[PDB]
Design a binder for this molecule. Structure first.
Ligand SMILES: NC(=O)c1ccc[n+]([C@@H]2O[C@H](COP(=O)([O-])OP(=O)(O)OC[C@H]3O[C@@H](n4cnc5c(N)ncnc54)[C@H](OP(=O)(O)O)[C@@H]3O)[C@@H](O)[C@H]2O)c1
Ligand SMILES: NC(=O)c1ccc[n+]([C@@H]2O[C@H](COP(=O)([O-])OP(=O)(O)OC[C@H]3O[C@@H](n4cnc5c(N)ncnc54)[C@H](OP(=O)(O)O)[C@@H]3O)[C@@H](O)[C@H]2O)c1
Ligand SMILES: O=C(O)CCC(=O)C(=O)O
Ligand SMILES: O=C(O)CCC(=O)C(=O)O
Ligand SMILES: [Ca+2]
Ligand SMILES: [Ca+2]
Lengths: 414, 412
């Protein structure tokens, strides 16, 4: 440890990403960077032991220190309750954190020149901002056990009126029902971040909704974006020869699929969650994408890997079999977090380190050293041989070597 | 107008699809087929005129006659209300029809061997069955004007305690809120249709949900599928060497993107709606896809194009400008409906005709006569010249001749 990093909130995860997380710290961060590290273990076991209170604490710590880096976590269902002998099916730690912090989640592929895409046309990046607050992650769902009436009601805080809407009358048998909601202020912040991101990149902005189907719910997003565009941002867009356009999600996914890339895609929370996986895989790997939650203040960020804990690879790890799991997304959670840390503190040595590690990661892959997913992009999956890639440790070690070299050359330079 | 078709419900649409619809009847269907045809105009003007009653009437007619073919329709938002001077913002006719009929919507790309895909890997078809009932199409959404409590309650029919849950307490400002629901029986029918489709195609089946997030709501879909699989179709799958698996939707879309295709994808209503467009475009055009609603009765069917009315091309049509818009999906709405009609009536002539029109459509494109979208698939869009594609009228004409030849050559 030499560079003085400052205050960072670290959230430990589960399964294969927890393995990779420790390797990143040991071989990449800790040798070169001293951090005041506020560490919260979001491993499923510690969440169960704390009644998921560690998750709320971690989110409050991020508010305090303005940067956090999160490892992927298990969101348990019934099967996970049985697997770990959990007390309850805990809520997604990502939902909990994003709903405490608010803001927009920006996701973008990590491009290496030698890696063929699955989608032939994307020669420019697609950047998905997605609203981080509300909707399905805050929803209230339940089983309808039998016949009866489901209603949803709104009571203003003065208690002077009540509006009851019929959801469904279940005449025969049961089913499921759910309420969900969003807030105007959170929607307004989301539009601002989306418009500002478009201007920062010089790219057109598209917002996707279902507003033809949900006329009030999605119509509110469409209206808030349009009001804020026509008032504040529309001339700035024209000055850069870019535009803002609302599209139906149906049209939007087809346009993106056939596009060349090079646009900002504003998504509702659920669409951004799902489409970012399609996009990341389309550029060739879920392991090559960045995800940063940018809070409305412009000060606080949470960087993360958007993919999951890679359970299938973890099961092989548990048997001693070789794994090749792409660490790049998890590494970029650290570099994006430290880069923001550096900016807040005007720390040039940290800013240099964060970019250096990003450069090493891409250069290493472009020199032919990669995990199996990326070799599968170059070859076909059925054509890949063991000699074509590196196991998770071998790849981390190669990154470690090249990082030491790159930082050694920087010190020698000038 | 020789072959006797039987009874078919026709639903007329809007904008560019409406133009193509009448061309298909004139140049393709009516010369070779006589039908007992119950026509319902779902064009946005007639729906307004009838206060949407025509949409429910058409759905009731499909229940009666077991087959319908639907042109794409406008679902109005505020901008459409002003455009057409509408009385109300009408609900989607597709939502209305699907929730009356129930069942599963099956969507599959129409493959021409000369058309390159956007997605490198898919050499086998992807069939999305999607639940036709409930969820977002049946939702109750509203604006929250200001601070206050939104709650959701369940009052059982047995007189027992009413159950109340807090949705959100808005502490400052307003927002939006929505209820939505689904029914056990509809989910069970959706499960059975999915398992049977996989066995009939010999392909593995995947169900995608968000059940880690919606634990009760999406958990019910996952539990019902798993229960019906274990007790009913499991041994049949193993005999055919296929399998059923639930995946989270995040994993599923990425798995699908990198696959070679060749599976049935069971989706919830909203996911199937959206993913079907991404899959159709990935095989290279929104114009090449079949969409067939299969009702739980095993009898009734509604065939449609899954895409919209193509407003942008319609606006150019309104200016007298040349357009190239892909009719194939609107045509396959006709062929799929007639094919089902022919199966119900055991009409071997109608069945032959329906297949022939499909073969003609594919063979025409495979010969190099295609609309602009398909030309763009081959050459890339910036490289497409005018000599590479036929305009919408030209393309319909070329299909009409190849059809006339294919049936005359079959007269032998
Ligand atoms: N950000 C988050 O905290 C987050 C997000 C999503 C899911 N999860 C959680 O993760 C757990 C597992 O979910 P899941 O199995 O649906 O999905 P997953 O962990 O994302 O992995 C599913 C598949 O995606 C591929 N993959 C994902 N990340 C990869 C990487 N870094 N390198 C190489 N391949 C990668 C692998 O494909 P192959 O099998 O073909 O090799 C893997 O088997 C669940 O408990 C879920 O709740 C967490
Ligand atoms: N089944 C239905 O009744 C249905 C389904 C969806 C939407 N709609 C309705 O249709 C209206 C417009 O929707 P939208 O503009 O979002 O999408 P759309 O009408 O489906 O088409 C939008 C874009 O998709 C491409 N496209 C769709 N069909 C095509 C075809 N047959 N041939 C060539 N290209 C095709 C065109 O791309 P390019 O612009 O690049 O040429 C078009 O501009 C709305 O009122 C909506 O409610 C109806
Ligand atoms: O939190 C979860 O359960 C999944 C999160 C996810 O898929 C995402 O953030 O893209
Ligand atoms: O009914 C609508 O408004 C849209 C329908 C749609 O996009 C679909 O059926 O896939
Ligand atoms: Ca996701
Ligand atoms: Ca659709």
């Amino acid at each position: 440890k030499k560079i003085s990093g400052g205050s960072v909130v670290e959230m430990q995860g589960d399964e294969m990403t927890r393995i990779i997380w420790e390797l990143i710290k040991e071989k990449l961060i800790f040798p070169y960077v001293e951090l005041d590290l506020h560490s919260y273990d979001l491993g499923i076991e510690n969440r169960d032991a704390t009644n998921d209170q560690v998750t709320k604490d971690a989110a409050e710590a991020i508010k305090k220190h303005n940067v956090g880096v999160k490892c992927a976590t298990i969101t348990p269902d019934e099967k996970r309750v049985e697997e770990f002998k959990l007390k309850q099916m805990w809520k997604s730690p990502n939902g909990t954190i994003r709903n405490i912090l608010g803001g927009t989640v920006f996701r973008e592929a990590i491009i290496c020149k030698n890696i063929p895409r699955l989608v032939s046309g994307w020669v420019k990046p697609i950047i998905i901002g997605h609203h981080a607050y509300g909707d399905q992650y805050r929803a209230t769902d339940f089983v309808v056990p039998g016949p009866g009436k489901v209603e949803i009601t709104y009571t203003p805080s003065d208690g002077t009126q009540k509006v009851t809407y019929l959801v469904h009358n279940f005449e025969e048998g049961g089913g499921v029902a759910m309420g969900m909601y969003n807030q105007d202020k959170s929607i307004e912040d989301f539009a601002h971040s989306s418009f500002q991101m478009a201007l920062s990149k010089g790219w057109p902005l598209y917002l996707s909704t279902k507003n033809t189907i949900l006329k009030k719910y999605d119509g509110r997003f469409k209206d808030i974006f349009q009001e804020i565009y026509d008032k504040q941002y529309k001339s700035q867009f024209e000055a850069q020869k870019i535009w803002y356009e609302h599209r139906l999600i149906d049209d939007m996914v087809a346009q993106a699929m056939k596009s060349e890339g090079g646009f900002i895609w504003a998504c509702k929370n659920y669409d951004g969650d799902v489409q970012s996986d399609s996009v990341a895989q389309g550029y060739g790997s879920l392991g090559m994408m960045t995800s940063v939650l940018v809070c409305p203040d412009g000060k606080t960020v949470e960087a993360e890997a958007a993919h999951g804990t890679v359970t299938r690879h973890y099961r092989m790890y548990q048997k001693g079999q070789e794994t090749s799991t792409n660490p790049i997304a998890s590494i970029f959670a650290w570099t994006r977090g430290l880069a923001h840390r550096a900016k807040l503190d005007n720390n040039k040595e940290l800013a240099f380190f964060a970019n250096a590690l990003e450069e090493v990661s891409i250069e290493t892959i472009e020199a032919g050293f990669m995990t199996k997913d990326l070799a599968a992009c170059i070859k076909g999956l059925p054509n890949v041989q063991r000699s074509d890639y590196l196991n998770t440790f071998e790849f981390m070690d190669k990154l470690g070597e090249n990082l030491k070299i790159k930082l050694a050359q920087a010190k020698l330079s000038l």
